[PDB]
Amino acid sequence: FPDGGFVQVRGARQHNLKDISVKVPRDALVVFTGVSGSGKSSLAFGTLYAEAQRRYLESVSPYARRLFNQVPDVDAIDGLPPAVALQQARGTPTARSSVGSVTTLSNLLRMLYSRAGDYPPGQGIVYAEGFSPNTPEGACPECHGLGRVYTVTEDSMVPDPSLTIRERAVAAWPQAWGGQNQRDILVTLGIDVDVPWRELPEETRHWILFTDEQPVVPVYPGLTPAETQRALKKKMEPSYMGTFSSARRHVLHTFANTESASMKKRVQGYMISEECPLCHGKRLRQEALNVTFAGLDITELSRLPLARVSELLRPYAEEREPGHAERVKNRPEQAIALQRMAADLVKRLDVLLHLGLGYLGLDRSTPTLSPGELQRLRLATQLYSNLFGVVYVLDEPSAGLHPADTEALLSALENLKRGGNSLFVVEHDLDVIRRADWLVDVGPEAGEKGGEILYSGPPEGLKHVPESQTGQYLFADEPHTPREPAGWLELNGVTRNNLDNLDVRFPLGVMTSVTGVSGSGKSTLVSQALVDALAAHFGQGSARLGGDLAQITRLVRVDQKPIGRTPRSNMATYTGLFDQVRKLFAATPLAKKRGYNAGRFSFNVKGGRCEHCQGEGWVMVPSVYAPCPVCHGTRYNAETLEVEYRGKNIADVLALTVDEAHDFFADESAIFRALDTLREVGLGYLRLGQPATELSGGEAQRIKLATELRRSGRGGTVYVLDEPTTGLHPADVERLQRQLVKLVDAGNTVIAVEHKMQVVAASDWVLDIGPGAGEDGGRLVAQGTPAEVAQAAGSVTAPYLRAALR
Amino acid sequence: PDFPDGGFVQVRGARQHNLKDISVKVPRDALVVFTGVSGSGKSSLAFGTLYAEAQRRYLESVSPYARRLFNQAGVPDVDAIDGLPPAVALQQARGTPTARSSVGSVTTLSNLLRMLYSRAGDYPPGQGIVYAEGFSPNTPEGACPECHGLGRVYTVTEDSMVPDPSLTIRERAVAAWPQAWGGQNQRDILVTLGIDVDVPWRELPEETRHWILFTDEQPVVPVYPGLTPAETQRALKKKMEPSYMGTFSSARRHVLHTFANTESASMKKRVQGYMISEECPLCHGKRLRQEALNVTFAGLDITELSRLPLARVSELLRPYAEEREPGHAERVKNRPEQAIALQRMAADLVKRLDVLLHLGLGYLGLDRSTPTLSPGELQRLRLATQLYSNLFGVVYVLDEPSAGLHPADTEALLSALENLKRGGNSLFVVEHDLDVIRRADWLVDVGPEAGEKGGEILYSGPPEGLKHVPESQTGQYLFADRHTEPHTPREPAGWLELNGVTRNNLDNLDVRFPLGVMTSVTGVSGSGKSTLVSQALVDALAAHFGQPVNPDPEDDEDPADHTAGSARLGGDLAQITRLVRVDQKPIGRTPRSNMATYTGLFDQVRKLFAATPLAKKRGYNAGRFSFNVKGGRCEHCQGEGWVMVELLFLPSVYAPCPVCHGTRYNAETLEVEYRGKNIADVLALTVDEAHDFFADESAIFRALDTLREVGLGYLRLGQPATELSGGEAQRIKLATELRRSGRGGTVYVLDEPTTGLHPADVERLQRQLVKLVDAGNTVIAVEHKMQVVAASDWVLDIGPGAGEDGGRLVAQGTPAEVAQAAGSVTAPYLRAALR
């Protein structure tokens, strides 16, 4: 590290950051550490990314991104090169988009299916972006590339095919006159109403149901068919003149033109999700599906794992593909480019693969990727992206990563950097922290008591800081006797993805860690197959339950996913905490004296809230959340704020930290109660009205948990939860474990997917999955007490577990 | 004598435009400069390839879904670049419009001082805080409410709307109304509601001819198009289905709407002719809320401050920043919170402003429209801004930052360049200026000549090295010894006065240009030259002739950004018959406009294809070969051959038409060949190929010749106006004057004519002007380049300095003479260049 090889930050203040300074070197693995909530993000993304983002955008687009003056709070940053963020900003959704498109590979075999690729006799050429499901030319024009449709069929419009038409055999039709009209139209149109439906010929039932036709026929109502037929022949004067409307035509048109509650509803009852009948779920025009390569259309290829895709092309790159012989001389132009295309396709593929992302299929949909999977995908994609001289900002690239592969990751970082780039990574993985060139560690604790720089330097240096929470877990190096299973629950013959008719069993009233290499199949076992089975069986693919079911009654399930989308929702809203605070306000002399309803203090309904914001407090103006205008951040009008409980109005308490709220609501029973369950979950740092789209999702998780951690009034529910270590510093996982240890004792089962061994080591039972990932996975390598799995042969995880028990 | 290892940017396999599939190492951390004659490919490498790829990479990495798809353009054609940091370009791209900004805007400073006026600056007793965003005409808290922040109110009036009231409505007497369908559409709606659409406008009763022309009303009437009022009424009686249902909208409404609701340039305009526009009675034209206007700084309201020169601005604001303000003590004690904010705030603007000022920029006013700056200016402003703008680790890419900079002030350009780099960055700089070049760190010199005859890398290495590269033209000029090739100044054949010129700097200046004789107008940057030559003299001569010069397909100025300041002529005007200015403004602002068509030579091409076997066999005339009318032309693009991408968020660019493929023509027509050649194939031809191909064809060869001798050998007959540099556009203009001059006595005004001209191109440009001075004609030209000032027959030396220390006629006479002048700044540079 040469002097003036550094980035110089002075007076950073953003959020809890306590007006601090840091030098951190460019061209190095700088790892940003410290307790959750402490300040790492507000340093790494709040200041460095944010600032560097901005000085650049204003130079590139003096157009109007500069014009957009409404900055991070920071006096100075010297030596800051342009930045690239590999995890999108907190308050954003994820765009709807595929693995292959994130990684660009999708576009690149699109080019390939075009130049190369086997055109059938006599039909032209299909341009690159006509093999895409998201371009007008490429997508099949029915489903629009989605591959699904949402419509009508025989079985939905006739749930009981044995009725006569007169009997309303055609459930999807109108009720009073509407059904009458048509029913009558049919008899006039020489069709017998009075046989059961199933009795009727093909393209008749199909006509009756589907036809976009609408003949206009004389209708003689309440006459018998025999006579209706005769009086037609006499050309006798009708009673009116009817328009026929195919069952489908009603149903759809209705869905398209009503503002009616049970109307739409009852019509959606003749509507089921089923695969597009044009393209058969393969997402593209027949003209694009017509083209084939290694005997596949591109959809087919796209749904293979990257790992196989890397194999399928591999010959072509090396010119050793059976057929190549009778292809070089008889077609030059392409065979040179085809090689190159494949050659280059493999080259990239391979970097992905070396990150063991080999199991993802390129059509896989990024909303359904995890934080890690995705970040590591981005990390791979950048490794060939070709940027030089930038700082990549990373957010726990090790999320999900299993301790054996941490070396492949530690590698891709070394390679990015080795491309003349700089690396800012916030991390908690002691294995990642261990190998970084340079550490920087944040807060002592979180929030108000955080946001100071405890130490910026090489990581060994932390040795000399007694009071760096991460100083300990990193440096200063009671075991666990598994508890007796109170009974067993079986999830049998789960066939899905990876998994194939796998039978499996989890012990009740006790901890289960389901370990295994990343992609080995934890989540489709435990967060997919298991969770569904259990919620189908209770109130709320094609498995069966079995075993001691009567012994469990509920299923709380703890996403990483956010507590809500809009600033509408927020931490108070979500827990039930706000209803008790609105209740309290409506109870005051002042509210009682005025007309005021309970929840005139809702910023979510008309009345108490100011009209500009119609509630929110944050008016949206990358796409970023700059606060309100002319309520002035509050969310409420002048009166509703006039109501004060012990000197604090509604907005006054919403802008209140749980710690302060706990002080405050001291003799207010089920509030001071509810607050403890966040204070214990460790959230004492947060505003009650801090919107959902600002919390770390690690945070979000802590809340959903905060909920159940006192509802357990009768403990016999199952708690299944994906990555509980989500975004927790070591010190944090300890306080986590604590809270689970508790909620197991009140007789509760907790199946937890888990890559960190620390917490597995403490489990009561373990299940190792796969042996490796993808197709090399989906099998049960080992189960039993940690000590028992820790000595198992087959498993990849056993030595790290053994490591973590000694 | 040493640039560091692997700290070179490595290019490989760059076959961009003409670029002959090349490779160059270019050190980072250095003032690198790119050289070569106009056409050689330096913009093709430095922008076009190196820059262009730094973005393709950097944005794709920063919105890896968004940008990506939008490489509906971006295939820089190169195999590899390594060591390429991310880039910032300072010229915006070729055929990109300047979107309308101001100095204060680009420099950031405007925003910087709403912020001073809000949080300090004098407030009247009543008034609470006006926030910063309330001192801008673009906010609701800013804009004066009566005129909506514009400056002025617009009402609409029968006389404007309908100028000739004798015409039948059906024959279009109501010019306000929209063209085409939308026209006849409101008409057919009238005939439906029983309105006499065929008896002179002035003949209807006031009420009904008022209502239409003025109402805020919308009757949803049935309309049957194609049918006379008589057979239209008996169609409404018998209640049969209408073709369409048609909403009506008063002529008012349409005209108002259209003004407030088009992104469109040439449509917001088309309605201005039907709008009377007073200054805003409440605004007094300043664009803002009376509340803002109440707040003062050192006497002036923000608008007042905003018209001042950057030099004045800092001049009046420095006292505040050093705390040497008059009555500081009395301000800090009774006001300690704001006085600290006031100095800190002041001193940051002064700081920004000296950068602005050290590069000779103080002559400019914060409120000057950017579309009226010269590129030399807003690039030097853009450089300017950058220095305090704080970026680190980047490649700046500059296109001739010294355009229009007088010799005296290069040292200035030259340490903004130095300073910027020393902020941790890379500059690359396309450059014809020998004194910049001589001080570069690395040089890339390009293809021995232009187009096909260039796009090579003759050399790349430090400066002294070009010494040894025999085919480098820039080499020749950078190292040629003092060429004692002295010019013998031509005798004026007359004299022309421009007396009492008052505008910008110039206050009653009296000056005389000799005639039939090349005169250069030299002067430091900012001093007066343009306002005197391209402004003052031209309107003075234009108004003296019938023709107000400027074609009608071309406009000029968003009503007000230049001066009325007039002045009066006399001398020998009896000897002048024509005015002809030549500027770097495009032959066209869209691909519609190519070279062939700007000359007129295309007509005779079209006619040629009309006498083939095909053109007889199917009914083909010149017109199925025009690309500006339907028929033989392709219609997906409309003959333009090109489509835009306003979806690309940053400055929208142009992509080949997807249907016809940059060709412009329906296939059926591309089958017609002339002497072995398509119609697209000829549009594709170079100037040197076309010469060959049409040797006999006299009407073409002729116009082609003037193009070749004017330098443009390498441009293509159909090469979209928008790929053209301006320095090439300028040269085009000139070719079509040479051509129609076998006469005498016109006066050519040339606003900087060595725009983006290598010393070898200029040398051939002179030759070319000398041809029309020998013809009797006069040429006047503002000039920054002592080379070409040497050749002249008369120098006028302007200002002393720029702006307020300028506007004077400090010296004059022959070059030989003027190089001896008293207080001329150009004085010693001529003596230098004369020897």
Ligand SMILES: Nc1ncnc2c1ncn2[C@@H]1O[C@H](COP(=O)(O)OP(=O)(O)O)[C@@H](O)[C@H]1O
């Ligand atoms: N997006 C955000 N908006 C507002 N406040 C935030 C945001 N992110 C974090 N904070 C606040 O900043 C402090 C620390 O946040 P953060 O830097 O995310 O900690 P960590 O680095 O441990 O994740 C907390 O008080 C937290 O609520």
Ligand SMILES: Nc1ncnc2c1ncn2[C@@H]1O[C@H](COP(=O)(O)OP(=O)(O)O)[C@@H](O)[C@H]1O
């Ligand atoms: N939502 C999904 N859609 C399709 N395939 C999936 C999905 N989730 C996982 N997979 C596939 O299932 C296999 C196992 O992945 P998963 O259960 O997510 O493992 P882990 O939980 O161990 O990361 C992989 O082959 C992956 O491609």
Ligand SMILES: Nc1ncnc2c1ncn2[C@@H]1O[C@H](COP(=O)(O)OP(=O)(O)O)[C@@H](O)[C@H]1O
């Ligand atoms: N922006 C552009 N778009 C299309 N063609 C261009 C563009 N710029 C240059 N060309 C063509 O590229 C060739 C090289 O010229 P150019 O790149 O302008 O380099 P220079 O201006 O330094 O000589 C010329 O034939 C020119 O007409």
Ligand SMILES: Nc1ncnc2c1ncn2[C@@H]1O[C@H](COP(=O)(O)OP(=O)(O)O)[C@@H](O)[C@H]1O
């Ligand atoms: N269009 C304009 N609007 C307002 N001020 C202008 C305009 N053009 C020039 N000026 C001012 O007029 C003075 C004369 O400058 P000019 O003659 O254009 O510079 P130069 O002598 O370098 O050509 C300068 O101080 C400049 O600030």
Ligand SMILES: [Zn+2]
């Ligand atoms: Zn489909």
Ligand SMILES: [Zn+2]
């Ligand atoms: Zn509001």
Ligand SMILES: [Zn+2]
């Ligand atoms: Zn006004």
Ligand SMILES: [Zn+2]
């Ligand atoms: Zn076209």
